[PDB]
Structures are given as structure tokens and as C-alpha cells.
DNA sequence: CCAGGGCTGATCGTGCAAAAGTCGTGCCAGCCGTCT
DNA sequence: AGACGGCTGGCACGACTTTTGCCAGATCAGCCCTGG
């Protein structure tokens, strides 16, 4: 399946995903310093069975069914700064633009 | 054990006596025929007899002489294979097979052309019969019932019937007695009639008989016994149709002039 | 009527061994198609930084262990470890049942409250409440954890003890005279409880390659978009010369001949492959025509068809088209499709026009995500929603299409504001 | 892939104990072999222990031999360098044997 | 072969030389004619003379002249082939195919259409038989036994029998008695039939007869000969209902009524 | 030396139809929400 | 607390798609043998 930017990464706290706007990316202007992230990814997972116990997973808490990883794009060690400015480039034929 | 009583009256004289006799006909398996004028209620008389015998579960299936057709009749009795003749898209089911483990009517044995007896002469004795192109044979214990207008006896004399169709047949006979024979049932058969018409037609209720039709009642011959009694009960009730003072006039013939 | 055995007339078919090789060609994939067709090339003699990065990871398992190694115990506990950590998935929680281990095990000394004690001291390493053994009890573990200080504990802790039924169904009104707990206070304890990370193995693998290649093209170029086939997946055959310019020269007749056959072959069947993918593009190119509508419009505009739409565009048959069509994948600017998937039942709506289930089924996905989270829309519902719409579904088909989304009910997806 | 290169059934088992096939995928199978896939259960690291053969039905010379600074198939039969090297290009016929 | 029991009850003079007569010709390869009276047990020779006969592991394959469809016909005595008519989709078998060194027992042949007496007379006598479309002729020896209560000689001169069809078919044609020509062994039948039927219907045993029902059902024309001797001694059992005292009822005729 | 006859091989052929499979919609059973 | 209405899902039955299974033959052209 396509992978898409929508800040909804699993196992993460709400610390981290506080300096992320509705798309994903970091408002211009701010800081970040070691390895917080930066634009949320989410990589698709093949369907599965019935599976009683991911069935059960998904009835509790939902919106995740293990569907996605966590493939966020997060600064590297070492890495203390400011963000300038961000730009998003999307082909022809997709027109999602949350915020473009 | 379900009693299948369904619509049965008429229990007043010999006719209790002879479904006193068929009662315990169903238990054995052995040829079974009955006769009776047309319309002597010999088709239910036949079905209780499904019904009353071990299997009252297997599948019910029936055929009549008079219908049928010349042709098609091969095919119809024994049964079809597949790509056996030209045109047969798919296998078909033979009539004998379709019904297996259950019992099977047959009527106007009277008739017969020479050519249908033949075919079902071997059929029902050892139980084998092949289907028209077919490679192989198959076996079946259908119950096999008769059902004639006539009598099959004097027939026999003029060869209007095989004496070896006629001795595989009828282990037992059971002849229904006239209704002309009976004169005691014409009335209870009589006022079922009555009321079910009346029922019908969402009328409130019966008023009753206006004994001139009982008189006239016992006089008529009655060629159809509980065929044209029914017919004849609904026919004049219809011309009534109301709820009040009973009914007078019989309609026996509806080809009569109004006027 | 009657029955004889007459002789019909008008019609037409023909077939041999080798035609018939050359028509199942088209019906299997260029990666498997290629593989096939390296064998013919065997039999057939004319036809034509060493570590790079090599960076080890983690993966979970790994890091388990690391720390069962730092942690002290004796041979028999760091021998029962690696059997409870060796069985243990992406997701963390561990497949075999606790008895079974006793099983690998095979000793007498052995026992389970020997298990419960080296389970539960690797049961909370790291990431917390991991090596589960069916959740209900890690979600207990990730509780226990933190501080007291945190209010609505207590209810969390007695609802995820055993009351999860309750929480499964969603039956909050039963949830609420079992548990005699707080009337619309309580959503914030399953608040709690939600944010309490199921599934805490998965986290450490993420690195998940990019792999899918596509058969066909189509794209966008200034409306009319038009097919071309991929290049580089098509497979290609081509004679050999040396041993073309071998074989009249030849002064025996078993060399001669041997080369005629062999000839005769390989001429034959690159003309059988050059068929496959003429085939194939005539075709792809006949099926993206009449949905012209799909690309842009997005899922919901695509017209029902079947086979016979397609076929009778082209001059082939039917099968033919379904041979060549089953697994090609063709990429265009909205993504990669299998090309099969065109195709579909239709059903009718008001107007004499019809629609295609999987429009429709792409419909009612949207419809039902775009609700009132209070009040669930219930299928007969949207039956008679969709019907505005124009569609005349009917229930269970709206049910069918709702139950393949992988979306349970109404009564089911209800939960509190 | 099957009987080929970073194959099954040759080179050892695979990432985890668990068979290609999908069967027999625990530790408590430490060195039974499968009936629906031939894997021996073992770790991962043998997988960097065991080479794999070809046959290589027609014969083949050794291109360390008889092409370095000494020819050891030269000095052991009392042939020269440019024969040998036209002899094993089929495009000399040497003769073998005859004394009659 | 060594050891075949079933049946053939009867224990009299006559019966004695036709069934060793059986015997004799059982080994032999030529056809046997079983002609008779209906009833009288035709089916009972017919099968075990065919495995007396030094072929017993082999096909056995019955029919019905009649019974067999005359569109067909050419099939159902011979065959066809895949593809020889827009119908067909495979070689066929046929009967006298299907009979392989096997026999072949026509029932009933006295009634077999004008065309099927010219259809098997000439593959008969020597073995050729062309399939339906079929390149090239197949050849077969098939036992022939067959048999029927007709009179061939009679029907001969009438001319609804071809002439030597009855002539390359009848070589030691078996004729049986009738029943009342036994005599002595009518009275061992009784007893056999009364008791299996008593069983059939969940009854423990036999009372046994009286010596007015020994005399009557003694003398009689007893017409159908074995077929109705078994009936009447088999319906009459079914009306006594007990074994408390002999038997005594006779049924004789069932169709004259019963008061 | 030139025309007539024989014989082998080279060449052309992607469909028709039969059975298995899917489709949509109805029928009926069993659970659960709500009023009396 | 009990009945009524609503909901869902299993299963069945026609109308309709789709998927697999066939197996040469005759006809035409060049070359070799032989007659004119
Ligand atoms: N004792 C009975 N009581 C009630 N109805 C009877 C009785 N006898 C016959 N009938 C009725 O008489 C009519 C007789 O049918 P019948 O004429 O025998 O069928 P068939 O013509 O097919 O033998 C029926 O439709 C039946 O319901
Ligand atoms: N000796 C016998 N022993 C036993 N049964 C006999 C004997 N004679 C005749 N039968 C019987 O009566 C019927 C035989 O039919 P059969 O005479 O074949 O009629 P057909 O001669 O007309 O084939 C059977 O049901 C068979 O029991």
C-alpha cells in the first residue's frame, strides 16, 4: 500500500509529536536538538487473518491494527538546531495536499 | 408418527372398514392396487398409504398412463444418460430413480398401450432397470400402486392386457364402495362442503338444508361419488351466498338454462 | 419433438501440442514467465566494495538478550531464558504457551513456578511488558509500573483485570452495572487505558524495504494518457547468427538436421512470445480506454464491466483476454493495480444506470468513517442513504461490501464522546 | 529460491529456526529434518560455515596453475606455455597416446 | 463355479430332468431357448444356467426386447463412437460389447420389434458387428440364452417372427412344467413362502394349514404357476393376522368381492 | 538437353465450449435495546 | 421482568462470469527423376 504523512505514529509520546503540526511537518521556526522527529511516515503491513488476538487488539484500542510502523524521519545523533524552512514536492496525478 | 389426518370424514359406513383394511397395508412391502369409480377418492386413499408405511419420509413422486406421451415415454420410465442421444445437454434422472425408498401411484392401468406396458414389464420384479444409453444398470424397492376405472379382469380375456403384467401386480385388492353404495356419508361429506364454501366467500355463517334437497339427494345416480357432491354443494351454495333462510335449490347440472 | 441422431452445422475450432504451448504462455507472470522460458534457452542452442555497508541491527530478539546477559541467574535460569525469549514475536508477546516451554525443556527438576519467576524477571526488561503470553495481563504490567499519584487507577486496573469482555463489545451501559463504576467519569479511566501501548515489541524493527515491480505504464500525457509496456520486464529472444550460418555448410545429415530443428523451434517461439506481449498491450491498452474515468476521479468513478466488455473491443475471445490479464500489474500515477481488478459486478440504480460494487464499496467506506461517533450508522441505514444517492443496494449486499472492508458493525464501532 | 543460489535445503537454515516451509519453527526442534521442507534447525551464523559444490561435468583446469611466473602443468609434463594454452582452448588437438 | 446354491425349492419328476438337463448344457458353448408358462421360473434357469456354463467371472448382461427404445435401436444392440453425431462425445459400448465373453439373456423376446429381429440375426450367427461410424468391424462371442412363454411354431406361420431367426436360436430349447402339473411338490412350496412372509411381518412362526386348505389350494387351474401360487398362499398369511390356530382362509381370487 | 511428373517438407493456424465459480438478494434464526 | 422490534449473519437458490482443457490436418512450392 502507498505510505502517507498523517502524524498518527504509533508507540510514541505526545511530547514528541507536540512540535508536529496536522500533516506531519515541524512549523518553521522552531528547534530541535538529538533525535525528535521531524516528518511522521508510516510504512503499510500486509493484511492478516481473523487473528482472535489482533481482532481483539483492534476492538480494544483501534486505528492502528498493526498496519503501520513507525518510520519517521528523526535527526540524527549529535544534531542541535533551528528549522529554516520545509517544502513538499508531490508528482502529478496526487492530489492529498493536507497542508501543500 | 404424524396421524396426516388432513380433510377424512365420511366415516359412517363399510368405507371405515376398508381404511380399516389399508391401514396396516403401508407396513408391508409387497404390490398393492386398488379400484374404484372415478373420483372414488382414489387418490387419497393411495397417498395415506405413503404415508402410514416405514418410509413416510421418502420422496413422493407420480404418473398416470393417460398422459404421458408416445414418444418421450422410453425416456421417461427408465430414464436418460448423458450425451446418450443428440440434444442431451445433461444427465436425467429416470422417473423409477427419482423415487427411491418411497412409494410411487400409478393410475389408468385401465388404458395402457401395448408398447407402455412392455417397457415397465421387467421393472418392477427384480427391481433393475437401465437408463436409454446408459452403460450401466441400477437397482431400486419402490412400492408400486395401482389404480383403475375398470375392470382389469375382463380385459385380460380380450388381451387388452398382459396376464403377466397383471399377476406381478395386485398382491391385494381394495375396492373403494360407491358413494351410491353408501347413502349414509352423502350428508356428513355433505356439510363439510357446505361450510367451506360458505368460509370462503367470507360469509358469517350456515343456515341449513330446506329438506326438499334431501329428498332429491337420494334419487340421483351419482356417476362421480365425492366428485361432483363437492362440485354440486359449492356451485349451490354460490347461488345463495347469503347467510340467511337455508338453501333450497340443488344446481346438479350447471348446462341447465337459467330461466 | 422427438429423438434420432441427426447432424448440426455452422462453426469453427482448431487446435495442436505446440499452438497449445504457445497459447499458455501468456497465462503466468513475466517473473515466472522468464523463468520458464531460461529453461528453453538450456535445451535450445541458437537462440540468445565486497561488505557494501553491511551494518548488523538490533531486532528485538537481539536486544533481549543483550540484557539477559547482564542479568545474573544460574546455567539452568539463563538456559530456560533463551527458551522464553526465543519464543517471542515482532509484536512481543510470546507464541508457545507457558506449559509447552516446559515441555522444550525436558527436565523433571523443572518446574512451572520455576518458569513464572525467570519469565517474570525478563518479563519487564525493555521495552516494558513485553514476552505478554496473550494481553490482557501486559496491559497489567505497563499499569503496574507507574506511580499511584495518577488518578483513576484503580478503575482502569478493574476494568482491564476482567472485564475485558465488557471493553471488547463496547457495551459500556453493562460495563457500567458490572463495574458500578462512574457514570461518563469511567471514559477517562478506558482513556488511560488507551493510551497504554498493545503491542510494545513491534517498535524496535522499522526498517521495511520498497518492492513491487509493474508490468504496464499509463500517464498523463496532456489528456488522452496513453499506454506503453515496461521495458525493461519484457523478456526478448533473439537468434543466435554463429550457429544460424552453421547449419548449410554442415557436411553430415545429423548436424545438418540437428540445426534445422532446433531452428524451426526457436523461430517458433520468439514469434509465441513476441504474441504474448502484443497481446498483453492491445489489451492494456483497451481496458484503461473505458475507464478513462478511473485515474482521475478516484476510486468511486469507475464504471461496472465484465469480460465480455473488454473483449468485444478487441477481436480476441474471452478466455484469452482472462488468460493474459492474471497477474500483470500495471503502474500508473495513482499506484500500482493488479489487472484483474478493473473488472467487477455491477448493480442497478435509479436513472436505468448502474454502478460498480467497488465504487460503491469505496462509497460506503467513506460515508461510514465520515459519522457522528455517538450514533454508528447501522447498514439498513445507509442502505436507504445510498438509495438517495441513486444506488438501490439492498441490505445484505450493503452488509457483504461492510463486512469485507474489514469494518465490524454499527453496534460494534459505538464508543463515547 | 529452490536448488539454486541463497537457496533452502543447502547453506543452512535461515534467519530464525523456523522452516521456509512453515512448519517445525521452534526451539524445541534443535536437529530433526522436516518431510515438507529439508532444513536442519540450527542458529543463523552457520549460515556463514557452509560452502556449496558444482559439478561441472566437463573438465576445467585451474587458471593459479600453469599461468603464473612457473608453469607446474609445463614442468610436469615437459610441455610449453603456448601449447598448453592453445590445448585448453580446443584449437590444437594434442595426441594423447599411440606408439604403433 | 465348484459350488452355486440359491433357490429352486421345487423337489418333482419333471423339474428333476430339466434341472439336470441345465447341468449338461451349461458347459456347453450353444445357445439355450427357454420357452413356458408365465410364472413358472425362467429367471431362475436363465441366470443359473449362465454361470453352470464355463464362463461364470465373466460380464452377464439382461435386457428386454421391448423395452429398449426403436430410435436408438442400432445403439442399444451395438453402439456408437465419439464424434460420430452432433449428440455423442465417446466410444460407446454396447450390450453385445458389454457381453464379452460373458452371456447375453434376452427376456421376453416374443414381443421384440420387426426391427430388432433384423438387427441381431445376422451378428448373431457369426460374431461381425460393425460399431455405429466405426472404421473397421468387432468381434465377439457373447452366450445367447433367452427365453418367453410364446409359442414360436404358431407365431412362426403368422409371420410377426422372423423365420430363422427362431431357427439359428433355438438349439436345446429347455421346456419347464407348469404348476398344476407337479402336483407333489405344491404342498413343500406352501409351507416355504407362509413361512418367510410370516417373518417379513414381524410374526413369530407358523400355526401351519388345515386339511380344507391343503384341499383347496390343492385343486386349482393354477394359472399363473409359480408367480401366483406365492401370491395367494402370501395374502391369505396377511388376513389371518395370528398363529394362535391353523390357517384356514383361503384367498383365492382377490378381485371377486369380499363380503 | 529440355519439359513433365512425383514427393517431401515447409507453412498456417491464439479460439469454442463445458463445468466450476462468483454474484446479488431473499429467508430465517439468534442476540440485544427499550417500553410497559 | 417480559414482549416487541431491530440488527446481523448464515445458508440457499437462480442469474450470470470465468477459468481450464483441447491437440492436425490439409495444401503449396522446390528439387530430383525421367521422358521427350
Ligand atoms: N372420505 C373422504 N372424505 C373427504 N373427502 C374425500 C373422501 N373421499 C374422497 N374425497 C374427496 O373427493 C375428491 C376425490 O378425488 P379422486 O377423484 O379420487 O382423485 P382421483 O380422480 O384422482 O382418484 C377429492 O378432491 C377428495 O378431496
Ligand atoms: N422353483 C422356484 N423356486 C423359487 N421361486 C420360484 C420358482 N418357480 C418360480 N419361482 C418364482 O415366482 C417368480 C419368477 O418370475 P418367473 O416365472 O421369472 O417369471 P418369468 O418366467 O415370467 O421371468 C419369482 O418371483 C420366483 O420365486
Known amino acids: 500500500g502507498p505510505e502517507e504523512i498523517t502524524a498518527d505514529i504509533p508507540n510514541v509520546g505526545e511530547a514528541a509529536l507536540s512540535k508536529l503540526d496536522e500533516s506531519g511537518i515541524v512549523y518553521i521556526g522552531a528547534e530541535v536538538t538529538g533525535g525528535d522527529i521531524l516528518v511522521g511516515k508510516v510504512t503499510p503491513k500486509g493484511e492478516t487473518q481473523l487473528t482472535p488476538e489482533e481482532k481483539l487488539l483492534r476492538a480494544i484500542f483501534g486505528e492502528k491494527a498493526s498496519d503501520v510502523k513507525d518510520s519517521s524521519l528523526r535527526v540524527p545523533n549529535g544534531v542541535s538546531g533551528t528549522v529554516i524552512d520545509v517544502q513538499v514536492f508531490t508528482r502529478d496525478g496526487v492530489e492529498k495536499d493536507k497542508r501543500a | ?259 | 419433438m422427438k429423438q434420432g441422431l441427426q447432424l448440426r452445422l455452422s462453426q469453427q475450432l482448431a487446435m495442436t501440442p505446440q499452438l497449445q504451448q504457445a497459447i499458455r504462455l501468456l497465462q503466468l507472470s513475466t517473473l515466472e514467465l522468464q523463468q520458464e522460458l531460461q529453461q528453453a534457452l538450456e535445451s535450445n542452442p541458437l537462440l540468445e566494495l565486497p561488505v557494501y555497508q553491511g551494518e548488523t541491527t538490533q531486532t528485538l530478539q537481539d536486544y533481549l538478550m543483550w540484557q539477559v546477559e547482564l542479568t545474573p541467574f544460574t546455567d539452568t535460569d539463563r538456559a530456560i531464558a533463551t527458551s522464553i525469549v526465543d519464543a517471542v514475536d515482532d509484536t512481543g508477546y510470546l507464541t508457545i504457551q507457558i506449559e509447552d516451554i516446559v515441555d522444550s525443556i525436558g527436565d523433571d527438576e523443572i518446574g512451572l513456578e520455576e518458569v513464572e519467576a525467570v519469565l517474570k524477571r525478563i518479563q519487564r526488561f525493555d521495552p516494558v511488558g513485553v514476552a505478554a503470553k496473550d494481553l490482557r495481563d501486559c496491559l497489567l504490567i505497563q499499569l503496574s509500573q507507574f506511580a499511584k499519584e495518577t488518578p483513576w487507577l484503580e478503575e482502569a486496573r478493574l476494568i482491564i483485570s476482567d472485564h475485558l469482555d465488557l471493553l471488547a463489545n463496547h457495551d459500556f451501559r453493562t460495563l457500567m452495572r458490572v463495574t458500578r463504576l462512574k457514570e461518563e467519569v469511567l471514559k477517562e479511566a478506558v482513556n488511560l487505558i488507551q493510551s497504554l501501548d498493545p503491542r510494545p515489541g513491534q517498535s524496535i524493527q522499522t526498517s521495511e524495504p520498497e518492492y513491487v515491480i509493474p508490468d504496464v505504464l499509463v500517464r498523463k500525457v496532456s489528456g488522452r494518457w496513453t499506454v506503453e509496456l515496461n521495458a525493461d520486464s519484457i523478456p526478448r529472444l533473439k537468434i543466435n547468427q554463429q550457429y544460424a550460418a552453421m547449419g548449410n555448410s554442415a557436411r553430415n545429415d545429423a548436424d545438418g538436421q540437428f540445426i534445422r530443428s532446433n531452428l524451426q523451434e526457436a523461430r517458433w517461439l520468439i514469434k509465441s512470445l513476441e504474441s504474448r506481449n502484443d497481446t498483453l498491450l492491445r489489451v492494456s491498452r483497451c481496458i484503461v480506454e473505458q475507464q478513462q474515468a478511473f485515474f482521475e476521479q478516484g476510486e468511486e468513478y469507475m464504471k461496472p464491466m465484465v469480460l465480455a466488455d473488454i473483449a468485444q473491443a478487441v477481436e480476441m475471445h474471452e478466455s484469452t483476454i482472462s488468460r493474459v490479464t492474471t497477474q500483470k500489474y500495471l503502474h500508473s500515477p495513482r499506484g500500482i493495480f493488479e489487472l484483474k481488478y478493473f473488472f467487477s459486478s455491477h448493480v442497478n440504480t435509479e436513472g436505468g444506470g448502474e454502478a460498480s460494487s467497488t465504487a460503491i464499496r469505496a462509497l460506503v467506506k467513506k460515508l461510514i468513517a465520515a459519522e457522528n461517533p455517538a450514533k454508528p450508522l447501522s447498514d439498513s441505514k445507509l442502505t436507504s442513504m445510498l438509495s438517495e444517492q441513486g444506488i438501490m443496494v439492498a441490505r445484505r449486499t450493503v452488509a457483504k461490501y461492510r463486512e469485507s472492508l474489514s469494518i465490524p458493525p454499527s453496534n460494534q464501532r459505538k464508543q463515547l464522546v | 529460491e529452490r536448488d539454486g543460489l541463497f537457496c533452502a535445503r543447502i547453506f543452512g537454515p535461515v534467519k530464525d529456526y523456523e522452516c521456509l516451509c512453515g512448519k517445525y519453527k521452534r526451539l524445541k526442534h534443535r536437529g530433526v529434518i522436516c518431510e515438507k521442507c529439508g532444513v536442519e534447525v540450527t542458529q543463523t551464523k552457520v549460515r556463514r560455515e557452509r560452502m556449496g559444490h558444482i559439478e561441472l561435468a566437463s573438465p576445467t583446469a585451474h587458471i593459479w596453475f600453469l599461468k603464473s611466473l612457473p608453469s607446474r602443468i609445463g614442468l610436469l609434463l615437459d610441455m610449453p606455455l603456448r601449447d598448453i594454452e592453445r590445448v585448453l582452448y580446443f584449437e590444437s588437438y594434442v595426441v594423447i597416446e599411440g606408439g604403433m
Open chain 2, 1 to 259: 408418527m404424524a396421524e396426516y389426518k388432513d380433510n377424512l370424514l365420511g366415516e359412517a359406513n363399510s368405507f371405515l372398514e376398508v381404511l380399516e383394511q389399508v391401514s396396516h397395508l403401508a407396513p408391508l412391502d409387497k404390490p398393492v392396487l386398488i379400484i374404484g369409480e372415478r373420483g372414488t377418492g382414489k387418490e387419497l386413499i393411495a397417498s395415506r398409504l405413503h404415508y402410514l408405511s416405514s418410509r413416510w419420509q421418502g420422496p413422493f413422486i407420480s404418473l398416470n398412463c393417460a398422459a404421458l406421451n408416445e414418444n418421450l415415454l422410453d425416456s421417461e420410465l427408465f430414464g436418460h444418460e448423458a450425451g446418450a442421444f443428440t440434444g442431451a445437454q445433461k444427465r436425467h434422472p429416470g422417473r423409477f430413480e427419482r423415487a427411491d425408498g418411497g412409494t410411487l401411484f400409478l393410475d389408468e392401468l385401465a388404458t395402457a398401450p401395448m408398447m407402455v406396458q412392455e417397457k415397465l414389464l421387467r421393472v418392477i420384479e427384480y427391481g433393475e432397470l437401465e437408463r436409454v444409453g446408459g452403460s450401466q444398470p441400477l437397482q431400486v424397492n419402490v412400492r408400486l400402486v395401482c389404480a383403475t376405472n375398470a375392470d382389469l379382469p375382463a380385459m385380460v380375456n380380450e388381451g387388452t392386457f398382459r396376464a403377466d403384467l397383471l399377476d406381478r401386480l395386485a398382491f391385494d385388492v381394495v375396492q373403494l364402495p360407491p358413494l351410491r353404495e353408501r347413502e349414509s356419508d352423502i350428508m356428513l361429506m355433505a356439510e363439510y362442503f357446505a361450510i367451506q364454501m360458505c368460509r370462503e366467500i367470507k360469509l358469517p355463517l350456515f343456515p341449513g338444508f330446506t329438506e326438499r334437497a334431501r329428498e332429491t339427494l337420494l334419487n340421483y345416480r351419482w356417476p362421480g361419488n365425492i366428485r361432483e357432491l363437492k362440485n354440486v354443494v359449492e356451485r349451490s351454495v354460490y347461488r345463495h351466498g347469503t347467510s340467511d333462510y337455508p338453501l333450497d335449490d340443488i344446481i346438479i347440472d350447471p348446462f341447465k338454462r337459467r330461466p
